[PDB]
Ligand binder design. Structure first.
Ligand SMILES: [K+]
Ligand SMILES: [Mg+2]
Ligand SMILES: [Mg+2]
Ligand SMILES: [Mg+2]
Lengths: 179, 438, 46, 177, 188, 112, 178
RNA sequence: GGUUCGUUCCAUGGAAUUAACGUAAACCCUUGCUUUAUUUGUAAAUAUUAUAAAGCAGUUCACCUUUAUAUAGGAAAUGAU
C-alpha cells in the first residue's frame, strides 16, 4: 500500500503565496539624496557636479565598483578585511547599511568612521579644486631635462611613476656622454 | 543686454514645426517584437569596448560555476548518512538542472537570468510529506509531559533557570536521537535546495561572479514545471542518461518524446492563411486624428468631455467595477497600500498579458544523437539517431503570412537550439536538441 | 571550482570536480594496465 | 510662432487664447476639494504627495495644444494605478533583511531547540494543524540566523491555468495502465 | 462613510497613455546632448520615451528622439576552420542610436535629469551626455570660493569611504588614482 | 624563462606560446618608459654623439621580451595567432561559431 | 605524495547508539565519570524527580516514544523503484527514490523559456510605469527655472559624461567665447 | 489528362489518408507612398533633401482570350499605377 493523497485545496492556496507571491506595499521615494551618487561627475559651477566628482574619486580608491545602492547590502567580508588590513587600502561603502553588515559578519573587525583629514584634502585638491602644475615654456632646445618634463606634464598617459622611470634612465644617459 | 555668444546660438533656429497631420491611410497592426534578451546572451552596449571583448569567455566560466553551485550537497558526515565508500562514479539525475545564463548588462549592475528544473524538490517534498501528522502532535505532548515531570515538583517559571533547560533538552534527544536525525536530514536537504534560490547563499555566489563583471549581480532564476520547455535542460538530461555503457540509446528517446504533450490542432485551420483587412478596432484606425483637441470636442459622442472617460472606452480599467462604469472612492504597523487594492480583480489582465505572448505552447521537438554509442570496448563506426515530434516552423509566417523578426538575421524566433558534448569509455558523442513554440 | 569549494566548505557543502575527478580516473585506469607515466628522471642521462 | 502649429487648434474653434482656456477648464477641470479628501483617504501619505505635484507640473493648457493619444507599441495595454506590487505580473518584492554571514546549518542540538521553540509558538495562539506543519517545512529556517525569511530571487510563478495554454492539452497517460 | 464619484483619474496616470508632453523653449540654446545607443531598437525606442517624460516634469524642454545614422561594422570570415576559403559569409554589428537635445535647461536641473536616468537605466543601452554651461571670467577664483560650499555638502557623505590610519597601500595618492582608473577602464 | 611567472595567472586558454606572449606583455609594461628614453636619446640630434651612442648600445642589450614588436595577439579560446580579430580576441572561426550561437553581443549575420 | 590513496576515514560518530529513557540516560550520565561537582547536582535532582512518579506515568512515556517511531515509519521505508523507471534507473541514493506517479505530467501551468522573456519584459514595463506615475512627479519639487546668462557670463564650457562608465575622453573641457 | 516560375492548382486512379525537413511563405537591403522625429544633417520655409522607427503596396484594377466548364493566361515606350 503506497498511495499519496493529492494536494489539498488548503495546501495549494499556501504554495501560491510563496511561488506566485503576495500583494506587498510600495512607497514612492525620490529626493536629491536618493539620486546623489548616480549623477554626472562634471566640474560645473553647480555644487551638485562637484560633489559627484568627489564621490567618484572615493569609488576609485574603494576599488572602482559602481555606485549601486539598490542591489542589496551584501559583500565579501574575507576580502574586505584583507584589503582593509593586509593591504591597508581604503574601502567604499555605497550605503551605511552595507557598512554595518560587514561589522556583524566579522569577529571583532573595526571599520573607521570616515576618512582622515589629509585624505579629504587630497581629493578636493585635484578632483574639485583642480590644482595642476603648469608646464613651463622652454625656449632653448638644448634644455633636455626641462623639455622632457614639459611634455610629461601635458598628458595623462605619463603617470608620476612612469615619468620617474623615464627621468631615471635619461639622467643616466646624459651623465654617461660627458668628458 | 545679452551675451554676444548667447545670441549666436539663438539665431540658429531653423526648426521644423510639429504638423499634427491627419492620417488618411489605414494602418495595420505592428509585428510581434520578440524580447531583446533572447537575441544575444549579453544585452549590452558599452562606449568603451575594452569591457566587452571578454564576455564570450566569461560565459563559459560563469556557466561552469553556476552549474557546480546548483549541485552543492551536504557532506555525508554532517547528516550522519554513513557514506558508501565505493569507487564507482554515481550518475545522479535527481538534482537541479540549469541553462546557459542570459545576462542583461547595465553600467550599474547585471541581471543574470537562468532557467532551472528543480528535480530534487519533486522527490524530497513528497517523501517528507509522508511523515504522519501525529508526529508533530505527539511530539508536542512530550514537551508538556516533560514540563510536569522533570521541571516540576509532585505530579516558563521564575524558579527555572536556563541551566536546567540544557539538561532538560538532552533527555528528549536521548530518547529521540535516531528520530530527530531523520527529520533533520530531510529538513536540511530541503532548506539547502530552497536557499540556493534565496539570498542566504546567492550572496556568496554573487561575490565569485562579481569578480568577472566588476558589478553587483542580480539573479532572476526561473523555475520550470517540465524539462521539455528548455532545450538546454533537455539535452543535458538525455546526455547523462546515455553516459552509461548499458544505456539503450534508441529507447531513451522514445520515453522522452512520449512525455511531450502537444496541443490539439485543426490541421486545415492551422495551415490556413489570413486575408489582409483593415482592422477598424485598432487605436490607430479608430481615431485618425490623435489630437485630444479634436477627439474630446464633441466630435460624435455627447458629454464625454472628460479625458478619463475616453481612456476607459479604449483600455480595460482595473480600478472600476463592471469594466465600464465610474470610479467610486470611499469617503472619510499596517502596510502602506490603497483602500481598494483588494477590490482590484486581475482576472482579465492575466488574459491580456498572456495572450500577447507568442510561442508559449511547445509545438516542436527534435533530438539528434551522434557519436560513439556502442556497447563493446572496441573500434566501431560512429552511430547516428534522429527523432522528432511536431514541427519547428514559424506558423504565424509560414502559413498565415504575418511578418516575423528573425533573431540575428538568420534564426527563427520560436526555436531553441542547444548542444551538449559528453564522452563514453570509447569516445565522444553529442546531443543536439530543438524545441519550438506555437 | 577550488575557490567555490572553499567559500561553501565552511557550511558543510560538497561538490564534485567533474573535470579533475575525470582526469584522475583516466590516470588510474592507465596504471591498472601498466600504461601510466614512468618515474620522473631527475638526473642527466648517463 | 511657437514650436507647434495651430492648424489643429484653429479648426475646432480655439483660435484665441481665451478660447483655449474655456476648453481646458471644461475638459481638464482640476480636482475639487472634495475629491482630494477622498483621494487622500484611500491612498497613503506618500502616494498623495506625488499626485498633488503632478497636477501642478502637468498644466492643462499643454494637454489641449499638444496632447495626443499614445499608439506606440510600448504603451501599457491596460489601465491600472500601479500602487502596489502584484503577485504574478510584477517582479518579486524584496523586503527581507540581509542574511547572516556567520549563520550555519543547525545541528541535532540546535535543531531540537528550534523544533521546541516552534512547538511553543504554535501552542500559544487539537495541537499543530496541517497549515502550521506545512508552514514549518517551507518557511521555518534551519539556519542559525533567528528564523530569517530572506528575499527569494525566484521569478514569480504563473497562474494555475495560463491563458492560451489551458484547454488545449489531453493527458495521453492513463492511470488504468 | 460615503462614496465620492471621482470625475477623472489622476493626471500622473492619465499622462502615461498620452504621448510624452514637451515644454517650449524660449531661446533654444542647447544645454545637453544625450546620445543613446544600443544593438536593439525596442529598448532604445522605449527608454527615449521614458526620458522625455522625466524632462517634462523638470521643466526641461526636450527635442527628439533624433535618429542618428546607425553605425555598421562588417566582417567576412570563412565558414570553415581550414582550407575551405571559397565559401565565406558576412557578419555585421549595427549600432542603433538616438539623440535627445535639451535647450534652455538649468545646469543643476539637467544633472538631476541625468542622475535619474542612470539609476533607472534600461538594460542594453549606452548613454553619453555633453553638458553646456555658462560662466563668468576668472575661473580660478570661482573654483576656490566654492571649496567651503562643497565641504558642507560632503559632511554627510564622507561615511562611504573608510580606511586605516596612514593608508600605506595607496602610497602615492595621485599615482594610485591614475593607474587604478586604467584597471577599471580596462587599460585606457 | 626568467620572465615566466612561477605561479600561473592566466585564466584563458593556456598554451606554450600563449604563456610566452603573456610574459612579453608584462615585461614591456615595466620597461616601456625606460625603453622610450633610449629611443628618444637616439633620435635627439641635439645631444652629443657619445650620449646617443651609449643609448644605442644599451637598447641593443635589452632582453627580447622587452621589445614590443614581439607581442602578437592570440586567441583567448584556441591559442592560435593567425587570423585574430582585435575586436573579439578570437580567430575568424571561433568568432563565427560564437556569433551564430549568440555569445558575441551585437554581432548578427549580414544580408543586404 | 605518491599515487593517491582513497579517503575512507570519513564518518560521523552518533551520540547515542540506541534509544535511552530518562532513567537509563541519567544513570549513565551520573556515573561519576567526568563533570563539575555542582553540575552533577542538577542531574541528581532530575533523576530523583524522575523516580518519584506513578508507574502508569512512566508507562505512558515508554509508549509515547513507540508511537513516534511508528509515526516516522513510512519516512524511512525504502520505496522500490518502478519497473519501467526513468529517473531512478541508476540512482544510488535510496532516499530520493519516489513512486514516479504523475511526476512528469503537464498541468497547463507554464510556458516555454521564450515566453518568459516577453513576460519578464512586461514586469519591467510596469516597473517603469510605476516610476512615471509615482516617482517622476516628485522631480518637479526640486526643479529650478532657466535664467538667461547675464552680460558677464561670456564663456560657454562643455563637459562630457558617460553615465557611470570610465572613458578616457571624459576629461576634455571645451570652451568657446566671442 | 491539363495547368503553373514551382508536386503550384484542378480533375481523376479496382487505395488511399497524413506528418517532418527542403520548397513556399517570411526575413535583411532596395523601390513608391503614409505617419512620426528636426541635431551634430538641411539656403529659405508653413518642410521638400538627408537621417530611421513603424505601416501600406501588384499583376491589384482595366482590356483581351480561355479546356472537361473544374483549375487560367496573354499583351510590355503610347490602359491606370
Ligand atoms: K598631467
Ligand atoms: Mg493522390
Ligand atoms: Mg543644428
Ligand atoms: Mg524620406
Amino acid at each position: 500500500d503506497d498511495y499519496d493523497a493529492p494536494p489539498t485545496e488548503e495546501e495549494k492556496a499556501f504554495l501560491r503565496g510563496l511561488e506566485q507571491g503576495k500583494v506587498t506595499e510600495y512607497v514612492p521615494k525620490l529626493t536629491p539624496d536618493t539620486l546623489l551618487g548616480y549623477g554626472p561627475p562634471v566640474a560645473t559651477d553647480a555644487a551638485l557636479g562637484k560633489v559627484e566628482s568627489a564621490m567618484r574619486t572615493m569609488r576609485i580608491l574603494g576599488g572602482g565598483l559602481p555606485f549601486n545602492d539598490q542591489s542589496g547590502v551584501t559583500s565579501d567580508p574575507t576580502a574586505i578585511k584583507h584589503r582593509y588590513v593586509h593591504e591597508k587600502k581604503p574601502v567604499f561603502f555605497s550605503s551605511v547599511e552595507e557598512k554595518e553588515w560587514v561589522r556583524e559578519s566579522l569577529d571583532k573587525f573595526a571599520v573607521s568612521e570616515g576618512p582622515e583629514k589629509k585624505t579629504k584634502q587630497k581629493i578636493l585638491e585635484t578632483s574639485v579644486l583642480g590644482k595642476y602644475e603648469e608646464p613651463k615654456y622652454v625656449e632653448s632646445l638644448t634644455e633636455t631635462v626641462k623639455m622632457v618634463e614639459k611634455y610629461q606634464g601635458g598628458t595623462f598617459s605619463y603617470a608620476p611613476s612612469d615619468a620617474d622611470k623615464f627621468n631615471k634612465k635619461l639622467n643616466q644617459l646624459l651623465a654617461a656622454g660627458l668628458p | 543686454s545679452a551675451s554676444v555668444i548667447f545670441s549666436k546660438y539663438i539665431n540658429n533656429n531653423n526648426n521644423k514645426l510639429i504638423p499634427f497631420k491627419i492620417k488618411n491611410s489605414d494602418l495595420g497592426r505592428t509585428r510581434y517584437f520578440p524580447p531583446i534578451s533572447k537575441e544575444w546572451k549579453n544585452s549590452i552596449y558599452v562606449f568603451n569596448h575594452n569591457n566587452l571583448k571578454n564576455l564570450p569567455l566569461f560565459d563559459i566560466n560563469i556557466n561552469s560555476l553556476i552549474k557546480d553551485y546548483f549541485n552543492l550537497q551536504f557532506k555525508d558526515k554532517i547528516l550522519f548518512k554513513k557514506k558508501r565508500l565505493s569507487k564507482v562514479k554515481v550518475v545522479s539525475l535527481n538534482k537541479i538542472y540549469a541553462s546557459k545564463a542570459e545576462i542583461k548588462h547595465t553600467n550599474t549592475k547585471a541581471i543574470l537570468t537562468v532557467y532551472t528544473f528543480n528535480r530534487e524538490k519533486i522527490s524530497l517534498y513528497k517523501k517528507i510529506k509522508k511523515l504522519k501528522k501525529s508526529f508533530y502532535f505527539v511530539f508536542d505532548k512530550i514537551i508538556s509531559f516533560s514540563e510536569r515531570v522533570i521541571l516540576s515538583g509532585v505530579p516558563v517559571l521564575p524558579w527555572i533557570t536556563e541551566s536546567h533547560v540544557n539538561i532538560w533538552r538532552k533527555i528528549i534527544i536521548a530518547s529521540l536521537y535516531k528520530e530527530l536525525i531523520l527529520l533533520r536530514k530531510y529538513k536540511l536537504r530541503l532548506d539547502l535546495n530552497k536557499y540556493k534560490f534565496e539570498e542566504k547563499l546567492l550572496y556568496r555566489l554573487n561575490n565569485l561572479i562579481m569578480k568577472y563583471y566588476n558589478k553587483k549581480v542580480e539573479f532572476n532564476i526561473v523555475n520550470m514545471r517540465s524539462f521539455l520547455l528548455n532545450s538546454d535542460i533537455l539535452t543535458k538530461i538525455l546526455a547523462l542518461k546515455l553516459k552509461n555503457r548499458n544505456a539503450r540509446v534508441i529507447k531513451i528517446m522514445d520515453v522522452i518524446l512520449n512525455k511531450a504533450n502537444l496541443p490539439k490542432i485543426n490541421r486545415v485551420q492551422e495551415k490556413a492563411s489570413l486575408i489582409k483587412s483593415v482592422d477598424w478596432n485598432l487605436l490607430e484606425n479608430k481615431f485618425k486624428n490623435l489630437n485630444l483637441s479634436f477627439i474630446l470636442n464633441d466630435a460624435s459622442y455627447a458629454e464625454r468631455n472628460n479625458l478619463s472617460e475616453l481612456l476607459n472606452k479604449l483600455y480595460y480599467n482595473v480600478l472600476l467595477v463592471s469594466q465600464k462604469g465610474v470610479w467610486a472612492l470611499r469617503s472619510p504597523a499596517q502596510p502602506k497600500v490603497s483602500s481598494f487594492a483588494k477590490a482590484k480583480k486581475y482576472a482579465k489582465i492575466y488574459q491580456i498579458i498572456f495572450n500577447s505572448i507568442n510561442y508559449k505552447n511547445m509545438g516542436g521537438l527534435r533530438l539528434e544523437i551522434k557519436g560513439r554509442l556502442t556497447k563493446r570496448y572496441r573500434a566501431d563506426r560512429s552511430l547516428f539517431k534522429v527523432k522528432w515530434k511536431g514541427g519547428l516552423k514559424n506558423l504565424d509566417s509560414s502559413y498565415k503570412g504575418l511578418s516575423s523578426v528573425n533573431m540575428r538575421g538568420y534564426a527563427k524566433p520560436n526555436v531553441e537550439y542547444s548542444i551538449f558534448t559528453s564522452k563514453r569509455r570509447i569516445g565522444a558523442f553529442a546531443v543536439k536538441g530543438w524545441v519550438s513554440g506555437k | 571550482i577550488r575557490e567555490l569549494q572553499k567559500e561553501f566548505g565552511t557550511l558543510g557543502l560538497e561538490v564534485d570536480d567533474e573535470v579533475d575527478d575525470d582526469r584522475l580516473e583516466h590516470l588510474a585506469a592507465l596504471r591498472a594496465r601498466d600504461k601510466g607515466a614512468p618515474k620522473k628522471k631527475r638526473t642527466a642521462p648517463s | 510662432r511657437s514650436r507647434f502649429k495651430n492648424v489643429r487648434a484653429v479648426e475646432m474653434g480655439l483660435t484665441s487664447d481665451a478660447k483655449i482656456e474655456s476648453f481646458t477648464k471644461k475638459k481638464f477641470a482640476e480636482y475639487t476639494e472634495d475629491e482630494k479628501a477622498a483621494l487622500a483617504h484611500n491612498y497613503p501619505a506618500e502616494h498623495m504627495e506625488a499626485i498633488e505635484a503632478a497636477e501642478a507640473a502637468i498644466d492643462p493648457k499643454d494637454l489641449t495644444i499638444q496632447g495626443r493619444l499614445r499608439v506606440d507599441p510600448y504603451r501599457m495595454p491596460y489601465i491600472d494605478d500601479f500602487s502596489e506590487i502584484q503577485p504574478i505580473i510584477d517582479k518579486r518584492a524584496r523586503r527581507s533583511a540581509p542574511p547572516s554571514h556567520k549563520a550555519r546549518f543547525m545541528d541535532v542540538d540546535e535543531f531540537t531547540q528550534d523544533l521546541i521553540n516552534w512547538a511553543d509558538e504554535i501552542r500559544r495562539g487539537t495541537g499543530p494543524t496541517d497549515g502550521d506543519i506545512l508552514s514549518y517545512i517551507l518557511e521555518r529556517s534551519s539556519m542559525t540566523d533567528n528564523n530569517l525569511q530572506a528575499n527569494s530571487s525566484l521569478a514569480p510563478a504563473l497562474p494555475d491555468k495560463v491563458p492560451g495554454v489551458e484547454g488545449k492539452y489531453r493527458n495521453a497517460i492513463d492511470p488504468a495502465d | 462613510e460615503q462614496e465620492v464619484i471621482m470625475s477623472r483619474m489622476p493626471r500622473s496616470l492619465e499622462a502615461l497613455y498620452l504621448q510624452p508632453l514637451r515644454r517650449e523653449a524660449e531661446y533654444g540654446v542647447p544645454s545637453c546632448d544625450l546620445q543613446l545607443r544600443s544593438y536593439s531598437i525596442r529598448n532604445l525606442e522605449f527608454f527615449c520615451d521614458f526620458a522625455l517624460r522625466a524632462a517634462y516634469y523638470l521643466g526641461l524642454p526636450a527635442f527628439g528622439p533624433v535618429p542618428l545614422p546607425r553605425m555598421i561594422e562588417r566582417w567576412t570570415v570563412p565558414k570553415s576552420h581550414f582550407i575551405f576559403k571559397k565559401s565565406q559569409e558576412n557578419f555585421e554589428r549595427v549600432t542603433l542610436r538616438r539623440l535627445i537635445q535639451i535647450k534652455d535647461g538649468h545646469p543643476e536641473t539637467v544633472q538631476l535629469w541625468l542622475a535619474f536616468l542612470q539609476k533607472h537605466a534600461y538594460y542594453g543601452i549606452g548613454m553619453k551626455a555633453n553638458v553646456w554651461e555658462f560662466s563668468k571670467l576668472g575661473v580660478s577664483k570661482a573654483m576656490d570660493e566654492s571649496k567651503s560650499e562643497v565641504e558642507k555638502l560632503l559632511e554627510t557623505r564622507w561615511e562611504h569611504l573608510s580606511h586605516v590610519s596612514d593608508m600605506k597601500g595607496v602610497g602615492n595618492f595621485e599615482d594610485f588614482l591614475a593607474k587604478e582608473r586604467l584597471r577599471i577602464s580596462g587599460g585606457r | 624563462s626568467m620572465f615566466r611567472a612561477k605561479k600561473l595567472d592566466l585564466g584563458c586558454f593556456t598554451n606554450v606560446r600563449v604563456l610566452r606572449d603573456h610574459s612579453k606583455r608584462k615585461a614591456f609594461l615595466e620597461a616601456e618608459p625606460e625603453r622610450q628614453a633610449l629611443r628618444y636619446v637616439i633620435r635627439n640630434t641635439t645631444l652629443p654623439a657619445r650620449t646617443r651612442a651609449v643609448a644605442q648600445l644599451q637598447l641593443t642589450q635589452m632582453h627580447a621580451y622587452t621589445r614590443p614588436t614581439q607581442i602578437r595577439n592570440r586567441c583567448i579560446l584556441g591559442g592560435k595567432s593567425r587570423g585574430i580579430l582585435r575586436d573579439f580576441k578570437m580567430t575568424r572561426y571561433n568568432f563565427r561559431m560564437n556569433a551564430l550561437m549568440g555569445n558575441i553581443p551585437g554581432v548578427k549575420k549580414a544580408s543586404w | 605524495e605518491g599515487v593517491p590513496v582513497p579517503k575512507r576515514e570519513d564518518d560521523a560518530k552518533l551520540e547515542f547508539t540506541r534509544p535511552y529513557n530518562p532513567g537509563e540516560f541519567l544513570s549513565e550520565k551520573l556515573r561519576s565519570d567526568d563533570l563539575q561537582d555542582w553540575e552533577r547536582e542538577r542531574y541528581e535532582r532530575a533523576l530523583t524527580s524522575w523516580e518519584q512518579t506513578p508507574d502508569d506515568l512512566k508507562r505512558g512515556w515508554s509508549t509515547m516514544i513507540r508511537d513516534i517511531e511508528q509515526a516516522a515509519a513510512p519516512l524511512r521505508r525504502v520505496v522500490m523503484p518502478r519497473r519501467s523507471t526513468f529517473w531512478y534507473e541508476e540512482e544510488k541514493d535510496t532516499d530520493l527514490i519516489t513512486n514516479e506517479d504523475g511526476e512528469d505530467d503537464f498541468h497547463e501551468n507554464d510556458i516555454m523559456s521564450l515566453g518568459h522573456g516577453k513576460l519578464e519584459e512586461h514586469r519591467e514595463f510596469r516597473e517603469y510605469a510605476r516610476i512615471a506615475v509615482w516617482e517622476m512627479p516628485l522631480l518637479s519639487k526640486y526643479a529650478k527655472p532657466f535664467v538667461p546668462p547675464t552680460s558677464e557670463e561670456v564663456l560657454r564650457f562643455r563637459y562630457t559624461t558617460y553615465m557611470g562608465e570610465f572613458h578616457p575622453a571624459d576629461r576634455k573641457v571645451v570652451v568657446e567665447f566671442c
